[PDB]
Ligand binder design. Structure first.
Ligand SMILES: CCC1=C(C)/C(=C/C2=NC(=C\c3[nH]c(/C=C4\NC(=O)[C@H](C)[C@H]4CC)c(C)c3CCC(=O)O)/C(CCC(=O)O)=C2C)NC1=O
Ligand SMILES: CCC1=C(C)/C(=C/C2=NC(=C\c3[nH]c(/C=C4\NC(=O)[C@H](C)[C@H]4CC)c(C)c3CCC(=O)O)/C(CCC(=O)O)=C2C)NC1=O
Ligand SMILES: CCC1=C(C)/C(=C/C2=NC(=C\c3[nH]c(/C=C4\NC(=O)[C@H](C)[C@H]4CC)c(C)c3CCC(=O)O)/C(CCC(=O)O)=C2C)NC1=O
Ligand SMILES: CCC1=C(C)/C(=C/C2=NC(=C\c3[nH]c(/C=C4\NC(=O)[C@H](C)[C@H]4CC)c(C)c3CCC(=O)O)/C(CCC(=O)O)=C2C)NC1=O
Ligand SMILES: CCC1=C(C)/C(=C/C2=NC(=C\c3[nH]c(/C=C4\NC(=O)[C@H](C)[C@H]4CC)c(C)c3CCC(=O)O)/C(CCC(=O)O)=C2C)NC1=O
Ligand SMILES: CCC1=C(C)/C(=C/C2=NC(=C\c3[nH]c(/C=C4\NC(=O)[C@H](C)[C@H]4CC)c(C)c3CCC(=O)O)/C(CCC(=O)O)=C2C)NC1=O
Ligand SMILES: CCC1=C(C)/C(=C/C2=NC(=C\c3[nH]c(/C=C4\NC(=O)[C@H](C)[C@H]4CC)c(C)c3CCC(=O)O)/C(CCC(=O)O)=C2C)NC1=O
Ligand SMILES: CCC1=C(C)/C(=C/C2=NC(=C\c3[nH]c(/C=C4\NC(=O)[C@H](C)[C@H]4CC)c(C)c3CCC(=O)O)/C(CCC(=O)O)=C2C)NC1=O
Ligand SMILES: CCC1=C(C)/C(=C/C2=NC(=C\c3[nH]c(/C=C4\NC(=O)[C@H](C)[C@H]4CC)c(C)c3CCC(=O)O)/C(CCC(=O)O)=C2C)NC1=O
Ligand SMILES: CCC1=C(C)/C(=C/C2=NC(=C\c3[nH]c(/C=C4\NC(=O)[C@H](C)[C@H]4CC)c(C)c3CCC(=O)O)/C(CCC(=O)O)=C2C)NC1=O
Lengths: 161, 158, 160, 58, 158, 160, 160, 160, 158, 158
């Protein structure tokens, strides 16, 4: 894939917006174009942006922030109350960057996406069974999120789990 | 997840007390039956391919309409998904058998499975029939050792 | 538990129990009777173990019970000895489970923040827990004492 | 601010072989922040990789 | 998020009009109280550990059952979660006090908190008792400037 | 707002307001009366500023209101003057709020592709905004003129 | 080994060996003499086991040695017996290690697509390994037969 | 510093400094003279402040210098007072910089693990820094006292 | 990155000493010229599009061979990359003008630019010519106040 | 990483032969020394904080220059990183002791440590002196059981 496609996909996956709609990360884009940084580094550059906190944390509960983080960086949804609660505690006690770093450093991210692929959703049971505490619940939640992907749901996070 | 020993520990911790004589008796009872359950689980692990083949054969001889076009098990992909689900049930029944508790089935398997099957159009009673067929196949080899865990799965689906 | 740890190890790789995990489970199931004996001995003598540990810890660091200490007063001293009793109960729980997951889930997760906010001196807790370790090692044979010392040392190490 | 460029060869022995191109993962040089130096150092060691070179440009 | 000035700007913009005399008086009142509000916020920030210590003590002296086994604050982990939630309440109350507006509490705190507590079994009345204890502890230190924000959290929780 | 930006930074890092954030907020609150004075002067003279800005921009570019021009016609010239009034109001908002957020959410996010679809010539808009800036600086003192010119120049730069 | 896996689990969490992992390692060290005896018996009778297993496999599936079979010809039959020797050696490695990693890295990882490219019938390999199971069990005692058949079962399950 | 924080924020968004960032930098530059005089007062009386803060802290907690205490001994007490001098110099760095980045980079990042390992009681350090803040406020006017107290309180908050 | 004040702080910290009279005088000098440097930065920011426009005009009039086919500026893409590089240089020179220190230019512009330009085939002498032309335009717009940082970029590239 | 058993397995696999009598003797001696190695490893685990404390104390008493301003161990961060490195060395020596082989030290500690220390300016001889101090402290507790692994670390750094 070319850098143009990867950039467009990165902005679509992480910020749910088209590159023309944003103020693009010029220097990170040029570093990715020069091979200085990997796709994963551009992804954390996107997650680290102020626009990410304005989009996904400013007017949202920490449960919603956690669901946003999982959808953007893992390609799935939190399945259990333990996983969701741990991530919420990370956002609330360490900040958003530490929680996003936890998601990107997690073995799930290396296994699914490595260092050179934009994250995506995979509605297969192999996606969840070894990885998730409740694989069937993880499938249901991820499939619901995919089915209405345009929407930013307002149903409480702990209602779903 | 839990096993029987952790369940006893959590109960006693809920009352916030040290283990009493009854708790020690109930945990040595679990230690007593561990060898039989280990042997049965090892037998199931050793013959998983044969058990899966025979169970799928039994299910689709009972309900051949699944294999016909328009059936939920008609394609290479959906047939593979069906046998993979039965393999999941077998493996998690093995986990429950070693653990001595059905909880691993409760969160790992049953939690969200009915929603999955209704959203996918998978026929739930046919899956219960397949689980019962696998229960009979496994029983024929290991005795009645896994009947409770397979019955738990079937009743949770039903 | 030991069994639960093996099952999650197997489940993570989406496979059946390996020969190694089977050996692990069989070893735990064989050790069960010795584990029950050690846990019973610790649970029956819990009161004197905790009392002697508190005595040793307070003589070692009398600043805890001096005015301005964290354990000063009858209520705070009772809280301190209650925490020692808690940790002994979790040591028995961990001896029974054959691993340290009950200890972590009931007593260690959050304890750093709890004692940091409350200004409880963790080194003093560690002195108390080491005292309880010697108190119980007196009650146990060499092998049983070695078995329980693993969990006592685990609690101490998880403190710092 | 300081950053590190690290050159590592990570073999793919533990994994099975795949028809997909994988040479970019095996041998690489990447730019990282200092706060990330320890996590990726340990991550490379976990995977059986060998650290070939470390540089700090300044 | 929203503070008082952005609230006034949003109102006038939705009416599609420039600021008038009344809006300027309102924003000047905000600028007038701002310095006292920063003093209160800085005092809360500097003494946050003491505030949490006193308020947790007050809560768990009022309700000793929470700490005993079976209580929702019985473990090191559940106690740490409880004091963490009080820390959240104080931090976001300080944010709201600086902003001069409670919308940050509605968005970041209250929305979904009732469902979180119901899902986990946190006793909401006892949490409101803790918020009230915090309100008293903080009022003993800064005066009555943060009373409305704690009252907002308490009304939202109940 | 300056306060909103500082609080959002603190919240994203899960911390209380830092000494630097507190100093930022204190500076903004101290500047409040000057900000309100400048904004009040700009709001009282909105009609004069917009009327002069439109005159200057149409004098510099008569092609806009000529046949075939973007603003040609009563309704289109009305929309052009209305946009100038919008940007002046947004500049007053930025002056009061101490940052550029109100100007961003209300009028600058999407204005570029909006003006691109409608074939609105952005150099002409910039000329109108510079005319409004000069009309305003005529009404304000040098310090007040500099304060308002910060946000006027921000709008100009964001257009280009 | 069991030691290697325990150390890797400890390194995954940046900690020292837990009481559970120490128990696992102690169990591996205790079972050393039995493992060494089983491996020695399997290694001494290697030629006997390979000949018996190959004969049984070829008799059960004569089409493998029939004209046009994957093992037709003395060179291809020799390579078949050589593969059986390889897998028996791997079973001895697994017995000695206490885990299945030597089997996986040396022979199991990559054998599936290897046999797909070579068109080797995997049911044939499975029957050959089962034949080696019976031959080995005939030379070991019941307990030793079970211990080695754990790894024989692992290989058989991995092939399918 | 204050300038570095604004420039990093602008650079992350790949833009020039916003009007709000310009006001932040301008307010820092205006505050420069009072920051310089506050830091000059703090630096010129560093020995007096550290001596008085050490005296107050050791009177409040005599157990630190009692036998078995962390600060017991001439070397440990002296280098405790050295730590207090370090923290006062870091507070002066904060007063000059206009933010807390020098304090975090030089003294705060890692101090929790350091003090946890070396048995250094954080409440004692907090009492020392509180005494230092009082000594500084005695030398400063009320406004300057609040200016320095911002950074003193930040250091205390990082400790707890 | 580093500004002048943080540079002085780090110099004093390397010796483990409090600020002396010399260090306070350097800090006072830095604060003394801060307002003029802010004014120059604001003037540059208000005119960035023009400055870049006639800077590119000067570069490509002094060397028209760059735009002609075969040149490193010959395409819409490579022309836009050239203009983006020059805008980078202007923005970072403005940053260093505010900071009073060339640290940001070294660590985030000059560092690695030489080998990047050789690996790309970018003509470094022509880039230096562009930086000098942009120095001339900026000096005509604000004076000699920003010359040093442009010379720093030019020397680091050359 | 690989332990002693796996090392013997790999050596037998290199020439593709079954274990000989000497291989079984090596395995038997490893199993014989395993119990004492486990005792030493548990001893180090139980005393890691103290071992670390007197190891760092020895290193910085021998070399006070490191802690002074301008030294590589002068800051809170840099001292913490130094002690963290020492804890790394201790833990991986314990892993090597349990495994009975030095592969873990070679692949997870020494691999890339020259380059890292030279890039950051860490004094390698001083790190070696600290490792020697840690070796002496450990030998004071468990005897000569683990000198080989600390010597391996020192010589891999020296
Ligand atoms: C429309 C998509 C589709 C495909 C492609 C498909 C293949 C398919 N063939 C099957 C059985 C079978 N397939 C074969 C064919 C084999 N016999 C010889 O060995 C040959 C090498 C080979 C074919 C050339 C045979 C004999 C069976 C029944 C024997 C058994 O139970 O395995 C089965 C198991 C269910 C059943 O009993 O029918 C499937 C899923 N099913 C589908 O829904
Ligand atoms: C570990 C616990 C676990 C279970 C049990 C589980 C079930 C499960 N089955 C699925 C699909 C499926 N499941 C089936 C099985 C049905 N076919 C019918 O003939 C039978 C009555 C029945 C099986 C006996 C089929 C056919 C599909 C494919 C449906 C489709 O793609 O439309 C899916 C969707 C993702 C995928 O395609 O892999 C899940 C998550 N997931 C889990 O994580
Ligand atoms: C699409 C472009 C591409 C190429 C060219 C490529 C080569 C390549 N071969 C590799 C491994 C290997 N390649 C070989 C094959 C060689 N050794 C034998 O002696 C043969 C003479 C010879 C092949 C004809 C072997 C044996 C390995 C494994 C060596 C090891 O990792 O220990 C690896 C490491 C990843 C892995 O182990 O799967 C790469 C990257 N990878 C790519 O993505
Ligand atoms: C079942 C798991 C569990 C644990 C482990 C636990 C520890 C624990 N100890 C606490 C307080 C306490 N902890 C202590 C103990 C200290 N006093 C001295 O300093 C000693 C060095 C040291 C004990 C050896 C004391 C005196 C208090 C009450 C005073 C305070 O608020 O700090 C608290 C705060 C709630 C309360 O006041 O009761 C918890 C949660 N609680 C639990 O539910
Ligand atoms: C920033 C806004 C915010 C809030 C308010 C918030 C509350 C919150 N509290 C939680 C758990 C909890 N909260 C409490 C607190 C209760 N215990 C009772 O005794 C007390 C009356 C009461 C507190 C005063 C407890 C005990 C838990 C653990 C529940 C469990 O795991 O069973 C959780 C689940 C995550 C975890 O397990 O730590 C959340 C999300 N989270 C947020 O992001
Ligand atoms: C409150 C924030 C806000 C802004 C800023 C805003 C600008 C704006 N101006 C518009 C149309 C327009 N805008 C202009 C003005 C331009 N054309 C002239 O040539 C001048 C160069 C220049 C003005 C100085 C014109 C002429 C139109 C109508 C063009 C058409 O009908 O396609 C439109 C399309 C919708 C409409 O027709 O009303 C928007 C969104 N709208 C908003 O809600
Ligand atoms: C140490 C790990 C290891 C393994 C496991 C291994 C298996 C293996 N067997 C091979 C060939 C072969 N393997 C077999 C054996 C199979 N075909 C028969 O029908 C039976 C069903 C079955 C044995 C039970 C045969 C007959 C060949 C010859 C294929 C040919 O040369 O065309 C090959 C390709 C290269 C070669 O000719 O040797 C490999 C890699 N090699 C290894 O280095
Ligand atoms: C923020 C710090 C920063 C700098 C300084 C920077 C420079 C830079 N310029 C680049 C490309 C380029 N740079 C130029 C500029 C040259 N063309 C010649 O005609 C001129 C003489 C000269 C400019 C005056 C050109 C044409 C390219 C495109 C080269 C190509 O695509 O082959 C690249 C490669 C990646 C990309 O194209 O985006 C970098 C990294 N990047 C950065 O992130
Ligand atoms: C400039 C940045 C910087 C800081 C902040 C710093 C703190 C610091 N203090 C240390 C030791 C120490 N620090 C103290 C401090 C006292 N202990 C008492 O209990 C008091 C409560 C407390 C101070 C008020 C003591 C007693 C030691 C000796 C501990 C030992 O040697 O075991 C150490 C370990 C190295 C050494 O022994 O010198 C550090 C790194 N070092 C730095 O380079
Ligand atoms: C588990 C395997 C592993 C090892 C071995 C390892 C060593 C290691 N030490 C580092 C820094 C360091 N290492 C030291 C230690 C030195 N200070 C001197 O006084 C002493 C003589 C000497 C230690 C005895 C220091 C001070 C730093 C920080 C240097 C700096 O930040 O500028 C770094 C850079 C990343 C960071 O600072 O977080 C690594 C990777 N990291 C690992 O993940």
């Amino acid at each position: 894939a070319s850098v143009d496609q990867i950039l467009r996909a990165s902005y679509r996956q992480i910020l749910e917006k088209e590159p023309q709609e944003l103020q693009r990360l010029s220097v990170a884009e040029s570093q990715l174009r020069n091979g200085e940084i990997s796709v994963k580094e551009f992804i954390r550059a996107l997650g680290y942006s102020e626009i990410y906190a304005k989009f996904f944390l400013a007017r949202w509960y920490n449960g919603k922030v956690a669901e946003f983080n999982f959808k953007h960086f893992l390609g799935r949804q939190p399945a259990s109350a333990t996983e969701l609660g741990s991530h919420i505690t990370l956002i609330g006690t360490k900040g958003l960057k530490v929680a996003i770093d936890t998601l990107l450093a997690s073995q799930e991210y290396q296994d699914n996406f490595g260092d050179d692929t934009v994250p995506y959703y995979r509605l297969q049971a192999e996606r969840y069974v070894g990885t998730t505490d409740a694989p069937s619940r993880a499938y249901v939640l991820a499939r619901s999120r995919v089915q209405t992907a345009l929407n930013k749901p307002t149903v409480p996070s702990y209602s779903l789990v | 997840m839990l096993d029987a020993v952790t369940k006893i520990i959590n109960r006693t911790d809920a009352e916030g007390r040290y283990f009493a004589s009854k708790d020690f008796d109930e945990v040595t009872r679990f230690f007593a039956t561990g060898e039989a359950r280990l042997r049965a689980a090892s037998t199931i692990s050793a013959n998983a391919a044969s058990i899966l083949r025979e169970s799928a054969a039994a299910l689709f001889t009972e309900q051949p309409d699944l294999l016909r076009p328009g059936g939920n098990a008609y394609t290479s992909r959906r047939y593979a998904a069906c046998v993979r689900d039965m393999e999941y049930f077998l493996r998690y029944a093995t986990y429950a058998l070693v653990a001595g508790d059905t909880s691993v089935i409760d969160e790992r398997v049953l939690n969200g499975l009915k929603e999955t099957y209704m959203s996918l159009g998978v026929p739930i009673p046919s899956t219960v029939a397949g689980v019962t067929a696998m229960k009979g196949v496994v029983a024929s080899m290991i005795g009645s050792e896994a009947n409770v865990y397979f019955d738990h799965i079937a009743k949770g689906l039903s | 538990s030991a069994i639960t740890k093996a099952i999650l190890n197997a489940d993570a790789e989406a496979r059946y129990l390996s020969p190694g995990e089977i050996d692990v489970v069989r070893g735990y199931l064989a050790s069960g009777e010795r584990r029950v004996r050690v846990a019973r001995v610790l649970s029956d003598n819990a009161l004197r173990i905790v009392r002697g540990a508190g005595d040793t810890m307070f003589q070692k660091r009398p600043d805890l019970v001096a005015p301005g200490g964290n354990a000063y007063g009858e209520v705070r001293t009772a809280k301190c000895l209650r925490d020692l009793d808690y940790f002994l109960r979790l040591v028995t729980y961990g001896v029974l489970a054959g691993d340290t997951s009950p200890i972590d889930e009931i007593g260690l997760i959050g304890i750093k923040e709890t004692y940091s906010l409350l200004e409880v001196p963790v080194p003093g807790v560690i002195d108390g827990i080491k005292a309880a370790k010697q108190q119980a090692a007196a009650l146990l044979s060499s092998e049983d004492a070695a078995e329980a010392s693993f969990y006592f040392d685990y609690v101490i190490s998880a403190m710092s | 601010a300081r950053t590190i460029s690290i050159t590592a060869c990570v073999p793919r022995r533990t994994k099975s072989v795949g028809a997909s191109r994988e040479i970019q993962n095996v041998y690489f040089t990447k730019r990282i922040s200092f706060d990330q130096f320890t996590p990726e150092y340990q991550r490379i060691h976990r995977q059986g990789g060998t650290i070939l070179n470390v540089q700090c440009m300044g």
